[PDB]
Design a protein around this ligand. Sequence first.
Ligand SMILES: C[C@@H](CO)N(C)c1ncc(Cl)cn1
Ligand SMILES: C[C@@H](CO)N(C)c1ncc(Cl)cn1
Lengths: 200, 200
Amino acid sequence: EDAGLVAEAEAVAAGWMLDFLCLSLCRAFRDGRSEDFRRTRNSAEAIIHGLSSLTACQLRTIYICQFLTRIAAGKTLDAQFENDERITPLESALMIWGSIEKEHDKLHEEIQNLIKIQAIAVCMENGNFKEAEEVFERIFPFKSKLLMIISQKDTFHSFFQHFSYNHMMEKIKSYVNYVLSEKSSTFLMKAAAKVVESKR
Amino acid sequence: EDAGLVAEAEAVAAGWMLDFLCLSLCRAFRDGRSEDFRRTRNSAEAIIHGLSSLTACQLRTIYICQFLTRIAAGKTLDAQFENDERITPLESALMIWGSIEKEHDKLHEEIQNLIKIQAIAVCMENGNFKEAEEVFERIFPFKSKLLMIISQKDTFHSFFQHFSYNHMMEKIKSYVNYVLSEKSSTFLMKAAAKVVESKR
Ligand SMILES: C[C@@H](CO)N(C)c1ncc(Cl)cn1
Ligand SMILES: C[C@@H](CO)N(C)c1ncc(Cl)cn1
């Protein structure tokens, strides 16, 4: 048994598992299957730990998984995460979004701006206006209007009608559909569907 | 998109991932690659969470993974595990070993008895003789001789030369070799090795 060749085969298989789990995570996020999403995230994250060297395509895949994980935790309070990074989950999604190797097109800008405003609005929704102001300071005439909105607890100001949580989720889901189509043909899902259509 | 067929394809792929990760765990245990073992265990355990219904073969696979995990933790102190089960890792390996659907042959009996004596001896090795006596009481003329050994702190008594930790590890590794050969041809490892030999 050649240990080098066994390690190489384990790396090929981890690459296949990563693409399959990204695909599974994308569909669970699109479908709103929260429990399936957290189980798939736990699996993808553990599989990622077994990899030491990543290609450009694999890095893009792990950062898409990290970004969707932060978006899904957008309205959830995680004590240890807040003490370690000193920022909120949507602010962490914003850092990943602005650093992924991808085209900065119209959809990219729309998603970026929707996350920026929702990082403040989710704090107002939870009743933490002091935190809403701290988020605003870390991210940012337009600024003076946004600061007056937070200060007046004007959570339902018309500005948030265009820059809503539902609009942020819809734009991100449209991006997820492109990722889903690009990976729909990856080895593991393709072979698994072949077994299903033959059964039957 | 048929959601039922997608869920079915995800179940087929999880079955493939489980067999591959069991194979990887078996080799890491045989090779003494501790860090690779804990990374593979984390991956196998997360993948197992994504499964709700298991065949007889899949149950045998998850219990082999659980047993090797307890054997690997044999000399390690885990506070939360001790408070939850009120037993040591080798005693938990013994419960799994005696309940797996497998032939109770000569090798099975040898491994069983080696774990029983090592569950006491690892406590003596760590200097906890009160715990060695509590382990003895939960598991058990031969008994009176074993009780006198613990009581006299006779850790290097000739009885432990035949029933040693190294002999327990060797017998378990011989069993691991049978599991390794039975799964050497499973879909994921087989396809991954094909890619490696073609590259080279
Ligand atoms: C950077 C890490 C830390 O838990 N992270 C948020 C993460 N999230 C999802 C996946 Cl699949 C992998 N990693
Ligand atoms: C029963 C569980 C609890 O952590 N257990 C010891 C476990 N160990 C290994 C694997 Cl791969 C799955 N499960």
